[PDB]
Amino acid sequence: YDYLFKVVLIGDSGVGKSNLLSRFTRNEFNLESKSTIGVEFATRSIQVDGKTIKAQIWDTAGLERYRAITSAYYRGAVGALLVYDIAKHLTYENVERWLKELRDHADSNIVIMLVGNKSDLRHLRAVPTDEARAFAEKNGLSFIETSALDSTNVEAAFQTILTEIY
Ligand SMILES: Nc1nc2c(ncn2[C@@H]2O[C@H](COP(=O)(O)OP(=O)(O)OP(O)(O)=S)[C@@H](O)[C@H]2O)c(=O)[nH]1
Ligand SMILES: [Mg+2]
Numbered sequence: 559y560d561y562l563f564k565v566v567l568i569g570d571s572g573v574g575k576s577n578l579l580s581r582f583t584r585n586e587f588n589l590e591s592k593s594t595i596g597v598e599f600a601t602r603s604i605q606v607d608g609k610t611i612k613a614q615i616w617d618t619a620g621l622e623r624y625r626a627i628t629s630a631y632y633r634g635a636v637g638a639l640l641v642y643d644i645a646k647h648l649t650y651e652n653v654e655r656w657l658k659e660l661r662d663h664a665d666s667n668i669v670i671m672l673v674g675n676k677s678d679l680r681h682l683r684a685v686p687t688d689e690a691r692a693f694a695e696k697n698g699l700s701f702i703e704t705s706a707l708d709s710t711n712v713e714a715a716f717q718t719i720l721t722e723i724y
Contacts, residue, residue, distance in 0.1 A: 559603055559612035563723055565637035565716075566664075568627075568656050570649040571620030573641045574675040577706035579617050582716050587706055594619045597631060604717060606724045613720055632664035637719045641673040644703065647684040650674075657697065670699045671719045677705035 567575040576594055580586045583600040598617040603610055618631060632638075640656050642649040653672065660668065672694045674685060687703060694701035700722060704711040 560609040561724070562612045562614060563637060563720055564614045564616065564635045565639065565719060565723075566616040566632060566635045567618070567639050567641065568659070569620055569639075569641035569673075570643070570646075570652050572646075573620065573643045573649050574704075574706050575617055575620065575639075575641050578639070578641065578673070578675060578704065578712060578715075579615055581706045581709060581712045583615070587709075589707075593621070602716075604720060606721050609724075611720050611724065613716065615716075627659065627663065629663040632660070632668075635664060635668060636723050637669045637671070638664065639671050639673050639715065639719065640699070641675050642685070642690075643676050644674045644685045644690075645676050645679045645682040650685040650690065653693075669719055669722050671715065671722075672699045672701045673715055674701070674703040675706060677703045677710050678708050 569575055571593060577587050579600050583602045594617055600615045603612045638660060642653055674690050691701050702711055702715045704715050706712060
């Protein structure tokens with residue numbers, strides 16, 4: 559590989575962080591929900607401008623009740639996929655709290671991509687696309703809606719963030 563980019567997954571529990579990771583790295587998806595244990599790592603390489611970019615994606619549980627995420631989790635990360643569930647407005651409301659967590663524990667120039675996941679539940683949508691997109695605008699973040707289930711935009715989300723990082 560030519561470059562190794564550490565990118566982390568963050569967002570409320572249940573939003574789809576883990577399946578987003580499995581879909582991108584192993585083209586797999588599981589409907590059985592299992593809260594993530596400790597910190598998980600997955601890798602994948604892609605081509606960007608003729609070069610080979612090794613993407614190292616970090617994943618962890620969204621709940622920080624008894625054990626909160628440290629700067630070590632974020633350390634050296636050049637990218638962050640901040641995820642929420644379009645069907646659960648609460649997970650969208652909490653994005654502000656995650657941005658504060660990034661501000662306090664991650665490099666000030668990290669590339670942050672807001673990800674509205676569970677696109678396939680468009681009929682149960684609680685967070686209008688235009689509103690989220692505008693929000694991403696005002697906060698200087700990239701934005702994209704995905705579906706780890708039907709696979710919509712998953713590759714595009716990761717591909718885009720890595721390219722932005724390049
Ligand atoms: N309909 C739909 N369900 C999805 C999608 N992505 C994940 N899910 C479902 O949501 C549930 C939680 O997904 P998961 O990937 O475990 O969440 P998480 O953010 O990693 O959760 P945690 O480790 O912080 S607790 C699962 O039952 C999974 O199958 C998606 O695009 N569409
Ligand atoms: Mg998980």
